[PDB]
């Protein structure tokens, strides 16, 4: 019940499906690659989750370190203020509860250090865990800071916005046929070194056995200097005449109603503000190829300055066209 498989959906996104793949694995370096690029919703969570985790973990470590040295006994049980004089043997001055260890870990890692919970020189394990906690805190801090700067570097690029018309046409220009779509642009910055390429996708057997299933020929776009470049501010019409060398040369008015054609168009180039290459692609199955229809004039010189009227981006009007073939039209004068 499904329609013929399309090579490229209207929103680019070549929908091929590679199977029989020699699946390597992950290498555990994939996680960091994913982490550097997340939607901002998450990178205000993994920040909080990392900081809060590390804090709590080192808090429990301080709790056990103090607990096993007998400090908590000396604080809790012995006299509160007067009946007891500290033996100075304590490991971490004035941390007599878990919450105290939390308010010590925060101090020891966010570099606050209020100074009501000092580090004495008795318990060597305490100094060891202090070195370890400080090192871990710095490593996490640098990684998170670099992640935040990376996700502030990519605030310029948003999305490829280059708009091709819905359905193409085929008309008459200078006594010869053609085939036209309509490219366009939206945002402020122009394109730089823009290029256009037209490929026709077909299943073309050969007289020598080979039958390439999905094979893609390239066809030229009309231009008086044979250069595939284009400089666009208002929408252009990148025509591509048909001739004996061209593959569409055997197309027909009625056969196109049931035919296997696939004219993908790709457009490449950079943008001045971003300074990043980019490209956009689309395809035109036979069902959305009209005939005789030509595109409409869109630019009208108003009183002050030129105006491009997007109101009729893809509107088409019928005009004279012959129902014969390209080879019929070019076969003979009388033809």
């Amino acid at each position: 019940r499904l329609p013929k498989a399309r090579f490229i959906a209207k929103s680019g996104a070549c929908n091929l499906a590679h199977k029989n793949i020699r699946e390597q694995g992950r290498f555990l370096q994939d996680i960091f690659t994913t982490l550097v690029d997340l939607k901002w919703r998450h990178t205000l969570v993994i920040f909080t989750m990392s900081f809060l985790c590390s804090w709590l973990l080192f808090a429990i470590m301080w709790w056990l370190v103090a607990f096993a040295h007998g400090d908590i006994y000396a604080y809790m049980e012995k006299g509160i203020t007067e009946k007891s004089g500290l033996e100075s043997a304590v490991c971490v001055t004035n941390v007599r509860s878990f919450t105290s260890a939390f308010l010590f870990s925060i101090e020891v890692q966010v570099t606050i250090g209020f100074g009501g919970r000092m580090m004495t020189e008795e318990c060597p394990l305490a100094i060891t865990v202090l070195i370890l906690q400080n090192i871990v805190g710095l490593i996490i801090n640098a990684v998170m800071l670099g992640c935040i700067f990376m996700k502030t570097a990519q605030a310029h690029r948003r999305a490829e916005t280059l708009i091709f018309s819905r359905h193409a046409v085929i008309a008459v220009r200078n006594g010869k046929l053609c085939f036209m779509f309509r490219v366009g642009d939206l945002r402020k910055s122009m394109i730089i070194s823009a290029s256009v390429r037209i490929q026709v996708v077909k299943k073309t057997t050969t007289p020598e056995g080979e039958v390439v299933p999905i094979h893609q020929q390239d066809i030229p776009v009309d231009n008086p200097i044979e250069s595939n470049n284009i400089f666009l501010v208002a929408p252009l019409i990148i025509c591509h005449v048909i001739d004996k060398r061209s593959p569409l040369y055997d197309i027909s008015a009625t056969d196109l109603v049931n035919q296997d054609l696939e004219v993908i168009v790709i457009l490449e180039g950079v943008v001045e503000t971003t300074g990043i290459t980019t490209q956009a692609r689309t395809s035109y199955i036979a069902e959305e190829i009209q005939w005789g229809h030509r595109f409409v004039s869109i630019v009208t010189e108003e009183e002050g300055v030129y105006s491009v009227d997007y109101s009729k981006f893809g509107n088409t009007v019928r005009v004279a066209a012959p129902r014969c073939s390209a080879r019929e039209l070019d076969e003979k004068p009388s033809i």
């Binding site: 020699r22 699946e23 390597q24 694995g25």
Partner: peptide, 11 residues
């Protein structure tokens, strides 16, 4: 020191 052989599994 393991073969670490890779075989894909069918749907």
């Amino acid at each position: 020191f393991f073969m670490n052989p890779q075989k894909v599994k069918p749907p």
